[PDB]
Amino acid sequence: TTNHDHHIYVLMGVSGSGKSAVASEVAHQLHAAFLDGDFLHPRRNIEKMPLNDDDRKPWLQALNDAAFAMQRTNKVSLIVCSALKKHYRDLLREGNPNLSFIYLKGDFDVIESRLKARKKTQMLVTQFETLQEPGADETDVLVVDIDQPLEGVVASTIEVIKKG
Amino acid sequence: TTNHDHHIYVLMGVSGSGKSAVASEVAHQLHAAFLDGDFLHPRRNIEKMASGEPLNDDDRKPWLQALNDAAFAMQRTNKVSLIVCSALKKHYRDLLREGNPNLSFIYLKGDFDVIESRLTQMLVTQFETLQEPGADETDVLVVDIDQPLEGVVASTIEVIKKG
Ligand SMILES: [Cl-]
Ligand SMILES: [Cl-]
Numbered sequence: 108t109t110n111h112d113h114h115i116y117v118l119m120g121v122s123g124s125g126k127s128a129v130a131s132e133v134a135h136q137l138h139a140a141f142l143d144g145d146f147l148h149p150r151r152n153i154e155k156m157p158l159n160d161d162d163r164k165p166w167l168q169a170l171n172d173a174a175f176a177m178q179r180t181n182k183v184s185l186i187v188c189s190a191l192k193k194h195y196r197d198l199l200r201e202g203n204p205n206l207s208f209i210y211l212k213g214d215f216d217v218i219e220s221r222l223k224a225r226k227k228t229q230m231l232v233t234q235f236e237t238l239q240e241p242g243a244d245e246t247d248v249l250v251v252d253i254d255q256p257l258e259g260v261v262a263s264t265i266e267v268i269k270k271g
Numbered sequence: 272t273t274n275h276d277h278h279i280y281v282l283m284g285v286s287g288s289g290k291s292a293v294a295s296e297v298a299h300q301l302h303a304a305f306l307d308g309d310f311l312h313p314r315r316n317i318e319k320m321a322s323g324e325p326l327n328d329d330d331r332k333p334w335l336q337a338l339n340d341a342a343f344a345m346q347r348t349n350k351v352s353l354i355v356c357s358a359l360k361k362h363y364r365d366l367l368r369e370g371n372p373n374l375s376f377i378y379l380k381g382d383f384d385v386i387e388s389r390l391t392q393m394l395v396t397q398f399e400t401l402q403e404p405g406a407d408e409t410d411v412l413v414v415d416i417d418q419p420l421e422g423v424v425a426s427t428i429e430v431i432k433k434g
Binding site for chain 2: 140142147156169176
């Protein structure tokens with residue numbers, strides 16, 4: 108069964124919005140479970156690695172199943188998944204009423220500079236075109252401004268998680 | 272491709288050996304990737320634990336394949352990746368190793384006295400299922416869990432840095 112006393116937060120946003128870094132630190136501070144969704148891409152997906160809907164299908168099912176597994180024994184679970192399209196989000200939501208999204212939101216230049224700093228440019232543009240910012244119909248979406256130092260993003264994400 | 276410069280450590284051992292607590296802390300201190308493999312279990316597998324039934328080999332199969340896949344995904348962009356998996360049988364370990372030469376195991380080892388205190392019946396069954404890695408398993412590093420968490424964490428870090 109779904110445990111309503113427990114909750115899943117899917118950190119979403121385009122590649123470069125710092126999702127893993129944020130999730131890892133938040134998880135550590137809240138003693139929460141943490142899953143970087145990027146690790147569940149199918150064998151085949153890693154072999155290819157602008158992915159398509161059919162590409163993402165099995166991945167999103169895996170992430171839906173993982174969230175279900177995580178909420179059984181964890182009060183708080185964080186899953187990183189860009190979840191750019193509303194449909195991807197609805198897929199994560201299936202049978203998971205106790206799941207919400209924390210949208211790490213930033214402008215193109217902020218994300219572009221983080222990407223340029225890492226250890227692509229066109230994909231980022233493509234990232235933004237694909238992204239459908241959650242609208243008023245999605246009431247389980249909380250937004251955090253990533254145009255701030257890492258510790259601030261972390262603390263904004265924590266506030267968003269604790270406000271309820 | 273496999274990046275032999277990168278490494279995956281599967282923290283193994285029976286339930287109650289503190290696998291998750293150690294992995295979490297280690298990953299954070301090292302900035303390593305971390306996946307608790309329990310989260311990749313198929314619902315049916317979850318359910319057998321619901322009623323308190325000990326798991327089967329065919330049970331564990333897709334679970335292990337997905338852990339194998341996750342290890343391969345983790346090693347592409349992380350120099351150090353930690354996966355929690357009890358990996359009690361030698362065959363489970365072999366499944367995780369397939370295609371992953373850069374995967375080894377960190378065995379959180381303790382006997383029944385300790386794990387019972389650190390912790391009923393499943394524990395007894397865990398030990399029966401446990402096939403302690405022998406000499407034919409060279410990518411197994413052993414960590415004594417009969418010390419505080421801080422020490423376990425430190426011994427685990429040392430094991431990862433020795434190589
Ligand atoms: Cl990101
Ligand atoms: Cl454990």
